[PDB]
Amino acid sequence: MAREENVYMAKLAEQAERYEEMVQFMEKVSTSLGSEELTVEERNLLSVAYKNVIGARRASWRIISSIEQKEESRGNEEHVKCIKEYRSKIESELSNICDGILKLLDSNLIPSASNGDSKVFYLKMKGDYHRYLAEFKTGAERKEAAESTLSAYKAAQDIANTELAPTHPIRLGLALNFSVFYYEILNSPDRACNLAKQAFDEAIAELDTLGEESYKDSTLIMQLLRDNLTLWT
């Protein structure tokens, strides 16, 4: 039995936009390996699955936080009691989604990675989910989220800057997320700007020496760095 039926189902889940189910499908593939690693196709699907499941909660959290602020500032105390209870239900889901993909990165995807690209990808992804904890967690939990994000992004960068070109979308993607961590979570606009510019310039420097479909892949991310650089200046 090769259940790459589980891969096909995840692809249908994706088409259907039923992302919780896309997660289950790609989780079944993941928890089914012995010594083998997720292919590129498979890890991307897993990551897209989780980005969409977490993304709906993050989008909901943002709108409920705005409404909370707007209402606290009109003294509507009764609204605020309600909005806050709603915000904490979203925070449980955020908290559980992050735990699921963190357990699977700590337990499985990270210890068993082989190539560089893989290691960076998964260490990057661990940083990503500690970052999402830090967007809404409060005290000790926020400090622990922020520390875990810095360690994972840094472990990913040491491996990236050795074992991958400056144009490799995974190296750019790390720089883009790490730049954002510095701006949104640590509140270092300088560190963020410098990190994005450095990885952009370093990628232009060695750009027109890759197959026409590579250019597509990483022009995409490089436009994301430039978009943020514009927004911040």
Binding site: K51, D128, G173, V180, Y183, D227, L231
Partner: peptide, 7 residues
């Protein structure tokens, strides 16, 4: 809006 990676 600020952006992050697609993966």
């Amino acid at each position: 809006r600020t952006s992050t990676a697609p993966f």
